[PDB]
Every structure is written in structure tokens, then in C-alpha cells.
Write an enzyme that holds these catalytic residues in place. Structure first.
Site, PDB file in Angstrom:
ATOM      1  CB  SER B   1      54.276 -26.588   8.976  1.00  0.00           C
ATOM      2  OG  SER B   1      54.540 -27.084   7.674  1.00  0.00           O
ATOM      3  CG  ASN B   2      53.029 -21.185  11.203  1.00  0.00           C
ATOM      4  OD1 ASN B   2      54.103 -21.334  11.806  1.00  0.00           O
ATOM      5  ND2 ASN B   2      52.843 -20.238  10.291  1.00  0.00           N
ATOM      6  CG  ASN B 269      57.997 -26.489  11.707  1.00  0.00           C
ATOM      7  OD1 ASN B 269      57.954 -25.471  11.017  1.00  0.00           O
ATOM      8  ND2 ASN B 269      57.330 -27.599  11.398  1.00  0.00           N
TER       9      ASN B 269
END
Ligand code: 3LA
Lengths: 164, 546
Positions: B1-2, B269
Site C-alpha cells: 500500500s502507498n 509499508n
């Protein structure tokens, strides 16, 4: 009862649920979600109930790619009745109401479904849901950063025998 | 995820801005679903949620947008048990032998004959939790066993927590609500508000041990390997109790990383450490956050975010839609040098040509060079000391970099790695004329839709994970719900897509509609105001009651 929601869908089938309280709000959510994803929820609930082997036999896997029987053992252990009840007892009135409404709205869609957007119509595992089923799903997600990553390992844990 | 939150000091409009780019499965129990929830006067929130949850998990409201990424904090501990030398079903705590608890569950199994049989299974439990076995690493022999204590088993606050987030007004209010309840299980939270605040919180449920206990309570060999393992034969290694924690044995909110700034915060992350390099987050428990080298996605983001130039919505969008394979920046220049150094070698010709012609992207039209680069990197990862510049703690953003072609040993091994990678690619079906989008797809009925993006481990911000299935690479997870929020005068402006579409059912009108748009990287308005909703020519309405 005391359940009512107004739903508007915009492009791509995005629902906008309006209601006067949490029960009504959940009602709209569960209904809209079921329209799009009834089969998906039904399947994941079977998983979280530890009933994969019952419906599908031991050769299949869950959507998490665990074997059906080890998955079932894990979820039967995770979602024991005492754990679900303690979890429920700890929920605020607002959260209880959201969940009650969700279950009712999902079930409403199921009662009315004719297959228009539901490919698993007539399957024995497509059935009315309970708030406990939503707790089962919640708990399954809760442990995805912990003991859920060790589901196979938990099932594999057995004391040694007489070996050298 | 960003996740990127931009504040008043860096945004083009002087307001807040949030890019939400969670990377999650395209099927199953974690498949995102879009919805907008309103109880007029007190709740008005839109975003996406996981199946079965009557709350918005990632979303936005009138003055606020927030998202999540999986954190690097531990949310459980393993306990190594010292077994009773007389009985492997007993374990010692402070030298006293305790019996394991046996909890049996019974499962029904549908057999070959279609009939049900009952299977009973024994789950062994210690005071810490159930025993767990990893054959060859965490065994249960006559000397030791391992139990697992999951901190989120006692987190009954998770649903209340997101519902509270759904009611938050601004960044300050969001922080209060999360810190008060501590119901977030295993993610970071990043947020921006209209006033131009950018917030990062590593605020989740994390086992707590007082600093003084860590040296003697850790299992050194296992902690060295990244496992949160503790000594289960000493009562002093129980999770510490602090009255300020919302749950007994978890870390109090005051001791968890938070960064509140007006420029930016980001996370892909990695730990809290380099959320913003101008203000490193340090001095936390090893269970919470460590100063570890950042992954290429974060290194990419920081390379775009640092500096003085104002950030526009378009900038954040294009960080996703560029599909830049950022790991190529560290490796490909020297790889091409090696290629030119070996033009006489026929085993390298096809690979070197493809790599030279490659746009360094994971676009639909990106050439086979991406495939060659992937297979090379998988082997490069296994080589010892092949970086020209190894990771430097003093230069955590610019290292590692380059190939140590200086060294004859490295040059040999890197050439061999490329030779082996080339052989693997050519052993596969793929002709060299094929483009990335010819290979990576998402199946919809009997048809396929080409999907842009590539694995996060190669530094593609638009992370897409695929597996070989039939003749193609079938998308399994990655970019999922996309939300880009700004706050112009009229109300929040949200732009994005749900990459895999609203419905998992092939019958639905909404089975592949957004997936076609994702393929073409054409993000759309997420209508939030009544004006926006009413402007939609596809608007449909149903009122229901019982
Ligand atoms: C009942 C447990 C609920 C946990 C929900 C998880 C938060 C949803 C957001 C993400 O997951 C972000 C990501 O995919 O990294």
C-alpha cells in the site's frame, strides 16, 4: 423492524445510503452490498464459520488459499460461541445497530433475489445471515496481522511421540 | 500500500491533499467495496470498505480524508516454551510445571459419497495462546514448543474505532479519536484536512514490553530474523501493563509514532522512520518501529516529494499512473554497461536488446525488457555484495545503488544471472514482440482485460501482483481502491476508481466497468455532494423498509 434506508446509486454502481439511525444505515449497506456481492459474502461467511469442508469437501481451498479442513479447524477455534458472545457484549449500541441492520438488509436482498446479479442462486450455502456471522468476519480480519497468519501452524501443532 | 498526505506548505492550493493507494487482494474477504454513508446532521462519509463491515475503512468527509497502509509493527508475540522434562504436554513458568489446555473442535466433512463425517481436532493452548508449529524452525519436541499471543484477539474496539473515524471532523479530531480508543489492528493511518494538516500515525494495537525487559525477554536468534519471539518460561516476560493503554498489555498511544506536519507525510509499508526524512521517527520499541532500509516504493515516493516545488493533484495521480519501475534506476544503467561490454555473446543478445529498448515502465505498451528485468532482479537479489554502493544508514534515500562491476567476481555472477534470466524468459512461451499488457490481465467471464502495473518489490508505485494461470499472468492483488482528495471551496473533490469494479459477480453491470477504466488509467469523480450525485445521468434511487 424500525429498518428503513434510502439508496442512490451513481455511475459504476456506487451506493449512497441515507438513514436516520445506525439500524437503517446498516439496512441500506447490507442490501446494496448483497446486490453486488451476495455470493462473495456467503462464501467468506462459510469460511469464517469453519464450514468449508461441510459444503465443499476436503480437496478445496478458501479464498485465502488455505485447505478447507485446516481452515475450518482454525475458524472453529477462533470463532467459538463464547468468543463471539464476549465480542458482542463488548459492542456499543451504535455498532450493534449497524450490524443488525446490515444482516437485515443483506437478508432482504436474498429474499427478493431472482438471479439478476446473483450467480449462486439456489446454492445451499447462500442463506440468511446473522449478526454472529458478521462478528465471525470481523474476527477473521482482526487476526490477519497475528494468529491468522499462523492458521496452518496452529493446526499442525501436535505433541511429540516416542521418536529418536 | 502507498499513502501520501500533503499539507499547506507544499500543496498547490495551500490546503490539504491525500493520495490513497492501498494494495489489497482482487478477490475474497479483503476485496474493497465503495460506499457513501449519511445520517443527516451527524455522519457523512464516503470511501471503501472490506466485505461485511458496516463502516467506511478508507475514505473522506467534508474537511478530512484518511487512508491506511500495513505497518511494520508486531501485533503478536511468539513465546518459546521450556517444556517439562518429564512431560512434553507441560511447560515451565518460573520453574513450575503447568499443563497445556486441550480444546477440541469438531468439523463436518462432506465425503466422496456425499455424506458428512465428523472430524475432531485437538488444539493445545498455553497461558499465552495456542501452540504453533513451523516444521524445521518452530518445532514441538521434548525440549521446547512455541505459543502465539495475538494482541488483537482482545481488541473488541475495532468496529467502534472505524465508525469513530467516520465521524471525525479534521486531522486533530481524527488523532484524538484513534489515540483514545486504540482500536486499529494492524495498519498505519495517514490523513490530510482542508486546513492543510498532514498526519501520519503508527497507531495500532502493539504488544507492550517495558524497555528494560527486552534484552532478557527476546529470543535473540529469532528476533534477529524478524520474529517477535519472547521467553515464555519467565513470568516477567508477560506483556507489561500500563494504565494509559486502552487494553491491558498493549502499547499506550503516547509511545507510538505520530508525525503532524504541514509539508508531507508518506508511507509504503516501511517503518515510521522515514515518513518524512526532515523529521525522522526514532527511539521506539523494536516491536513498534525500527530504522530499516526503506523499500523501493518509498524511495521512489521520496524522490518525487522532497524539495520545494508545490505538489498538484495531477502530480500525485501521475506517481501512480506513470508505472515507473523505480528499481531499474538503481540497477539498469550498470546492467546496460555490462550488456555493451558483452556484445559478442549470443546468450545475452535478446535480453540486452529488450532491456535497451525498454521504457523502464510497467505500462500496457512497455516492452519485454520488463520481463527480462524481473527475472534478472530475482537472481540479483540472491547475489552477495553485488551493490556498487551498499545501503548506507547515513544516506538512507540514495543507497543501495549500482552494480559492483569493479569486482571480477560480481561481474561474473551478474553476467551469469542475466544469462540465466534470459534462458528462463526464452524457455517460456512469450515472443519478444509481446508487450507487458499482452501478458498481465484480469479475467472477466471468458474475456481478459490488460492490467498496467507491476510488483511493488520492483519499485512500481502502482503495485500489481500476478500469478501464471493458463497463458497469462492473472492479477491477484495490488492497486484496488484509489482515492485522491483535495478540498476546493465548494466541497471535497475526490478522484479515483475501484480497479476490480464494485461487483465480484459476472452477471452484474458493475463486474468489469471500472476495470476497463483502470486498464486505460482513466480515474473518475467520486461524487460526494448532493449536487454531484444529482448531476450523474446514471443516478438510480431505491427506498426500502421492513
Ligand atoms: C475488522 C478488522 C478491520 C481491518 C480493516 C483494515 C483497514 C482497511 C485498510 C487497509 O487494509 C489498507 C491496506 O490494504 O493496506
Amino acid at each position: 423492524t424500525g429498518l428503513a434506508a434510502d439508496i442512490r446509486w451513481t455511475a459504476y454502481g456506487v451506493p449512497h445510503i441515507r438513514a436516520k439511525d445506525e439500524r437503517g444505515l446498516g439496512y441500506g449497506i447490507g442490501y446494496a452490498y448483497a446486490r453486488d456481492n451476495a455470493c462473495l459474502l456467503a462464501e467468506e461467511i462459510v469460511t469464517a464459520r469453519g464450514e468449508r469442508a461441510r459444503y465443499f469437501g476436503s480437496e478445496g481451498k478458501s479464498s485465502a488459499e488455505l485447505d478447507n479442513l485446516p481452515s475450518d479447524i482454525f475458524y472453529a477455534w477462533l470463532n467459538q460461541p463464547e468468543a463471539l458472545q464476549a465480542f458482542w457484549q463488548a459492542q456499543t449500541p451504535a455498532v450493534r445497530q449497524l450490524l443488525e441492520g446490515y444482516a437485515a438488509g443483506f437478508n432482504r436482498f436474498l429474499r427478493e433475489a431472482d438471479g439478476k446479479t446473483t450467480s449462486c442462486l439456489g446454492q445451499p450455502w447462500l442463506r440468511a445471515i446473522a449478526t454472529d456471522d458478521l462478528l465471525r468476519l470481523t474476527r477473521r480480519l482482526l487476526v490477519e496481522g497475528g494468529v491468522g497468519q499462523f492458521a496452518d501452524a496452529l493446526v499442525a501443532a501436535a505433541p511429540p511421540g516416542a521418536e529418536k | 500500500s502507498n499513502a501520501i498526505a500533503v499539507g499547506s506548505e507544499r500543496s498547490a492550493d495551500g490546503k490539504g491533499m491525500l493520495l490513497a493507494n492501498p494494495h489489497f487482494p482482487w478477490n475474497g474477504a479483503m476485496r474493497f467495496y465503495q460506499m457513501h454513508l449519511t445520517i443527516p446532521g451527524r455522519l457523512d462519509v464516503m470511501g471503501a470498505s472490506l466485505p461485511g463491515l458496516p463502516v467506511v475503512n478508507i475514505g473522506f468527509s467534508r474537511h478530512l480524508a484518511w487512508t491506511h497502509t500495513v505497518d511494520t509493527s508486531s501485533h503478536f508475540t511468539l513465546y518459546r516454551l521450556a517444556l517439562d522434562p518429564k512431560d512434553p504436554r507441560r511447560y515451565l513458568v518460573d520453574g513450575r510445571s503447568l499443563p497445556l489446555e486441550e480444546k477440541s473442535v469438531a468439523i463436518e466433512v462432506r465425503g466422496a459419497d456425499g455424506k458428512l463425517s465428523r472430524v475432531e481436532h485437538k488444539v493445545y493452548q498455553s497461558i499465552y495462546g495456542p501452540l504453533v508449529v513451523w516444521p524445521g524452525k518452530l518445532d514441538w519436541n521434548r525440549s521446547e514448543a512455541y505459543a502465539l499471543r495475538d494482541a488483537n484477539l482482545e481488541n473488541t474496539r475495532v468496529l467502534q474505532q472505524w465508525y469513530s473515524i467516520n465521524q471525525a471532523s479534521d486531522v486533530a479530531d481524527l488523532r484524538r479519536r484513534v489515540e483514545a480508543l486504540q482500536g486499529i489492528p494492524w495498519v498505519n493511518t495517514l490523513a490530510a484536512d482542508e486546513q492543510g494538516n498532514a498526519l501520519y500515525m503508527n497507531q495500532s494495537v502493539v504488544p507492550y514490553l517495558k524497555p528494560e525487559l527486552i534484552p532478557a525477554c527476546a529470543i535473540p536468534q529469532l528476533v534477529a530474523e524478524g520474529l517477535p519471539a519472547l521467553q515464555g518460561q519467565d513470568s516477567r516476560c508477560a506483556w507489561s501493563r500500563d494504565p494509559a493503554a486502552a487494553q491491558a498489555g498493549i502499547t499506550p498511544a503516547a509511545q507510538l509514532p505520530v508525525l503532524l506536519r504541514r509539508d508531507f507525510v508518506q508511507n509504503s509499508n516501511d517503518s515510521a522512520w522515514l515518513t518524512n526524512p526532515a523529521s525522522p521517527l526514532q527511539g521506539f520499541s523494536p516491536l513498534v518501529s525500527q530504522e530499516k532500509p526503506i523499500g523501493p516504493r518509498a524511495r521512489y515516493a521520496l524522490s518525487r516529494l522532497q524539495g520545494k516545488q508545490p505538489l498538484e493533484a495531477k502530480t500525485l495521480e501521475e506517481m501512480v499512473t506513470a508505472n515507473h519501475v523505480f528499481s531499474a534506476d538503481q540497477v539498469l544503467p550498470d546492467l546496460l554497461r555490462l550488456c555493451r561490454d558483452n556484445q559478442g555473446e549470443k546468450s545475452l543478445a535478446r535480453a540486452c536488446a529488450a532491456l535497451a529498448q525498454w521504457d523502464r515502465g510497467a505500462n500496457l505498451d512497455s516492452g519485454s525488457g520488463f520481463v527480462y528485468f524481473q527475472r534478472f532482479m530475482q537472481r540479483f537479489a540472491e547475489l552477495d555484495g553485488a551493490w556498487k554502493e551498499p545501503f548506507d544508514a547515513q544516506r538512507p534515500l540514495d543507497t543501495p545503488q549500482g552494480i559492483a562491476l569493479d569486482r571480477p567476481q560480481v561481474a561474473t555472477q551478474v553476467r551469469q544471472a542475466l544469462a540465466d534470466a534470459a534462458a528462463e524468459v526464452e524457455k517460456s512461451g512469450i515472443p519478444d514482440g509481446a508487450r507487458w499488457g499482452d501478458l498481465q490481465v484480469s479475467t472477466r467471464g471468458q474475456e481478459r482485460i490488460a492490467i498496467p502495473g507491476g510488483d511493488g518489490h520492483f519499485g512500481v508505485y502502482n503495485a500489481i501482483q500476478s500469478v501464471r494461470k493458463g497463458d497469462h499472468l492473472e492479477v491477484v492483488g495490488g492497486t484496488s481502491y484509489i482515492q485522491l482528495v483535495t478540498f476546493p471551496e465548494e466541497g471535497p473533490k475526490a478522484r479515483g476508481l475501484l480497479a476490480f469494479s464494485q461487483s465480484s459477480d459476472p452477471r452484474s453491470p458493475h463486474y468489469r466497468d471500472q476495470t476497463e477504466l483502470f486498464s486505460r488509467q482513466q480515474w473518475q469523480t467520486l461524487p460526494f455532494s448532493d449536487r454531484q450525485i444529482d448531476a450523474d445521468p446514471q443516478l438510480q434511487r431505491l427506498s426500502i423498509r421492513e
